[PDB]
């Protein structure tokens, strides 16, 4: 049901633009929120469709952005 991912281990200088570019490879992004405040190396990536969030988990998770191995996980519950 959730189409949103927590993204962790981002470099301090990583921008929303770079997250847009990387995460758009698995689908269309509805919203990106930098930081842990949905209203530190974390951001939220929300997709329009669940399939696209799953493909980010499958193929973006565990790869590099600003030479850092990023980690993604579902923002659900």
């Amino acid at each position: 049901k959730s189409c949103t991912l927590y993204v962790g281990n981002l470099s301090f200088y990583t921008t929303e633009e770079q997250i847009y570019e990387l995460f758009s490879k698995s689908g269309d992004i509805k919203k990106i929120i930098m930081g842990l405040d949905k209203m530190c190396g974390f951001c939220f990536v929300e997709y329009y469709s669940r399939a696209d969030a799953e493909n980010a988990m499958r193929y973006i998770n565990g790869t590099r952005l600003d030479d850092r191995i990023i980690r993604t996980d579902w923002d659900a519950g």
Partner: peptide, 11 residues
């Protein structure tokens, strides 16, 4: 399959 898969597969 989705294009990005191939990139990560090669990695």
């Amino acid at each position: 399959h989705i294009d990005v898969m191939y990139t990560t597969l090669l990695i």
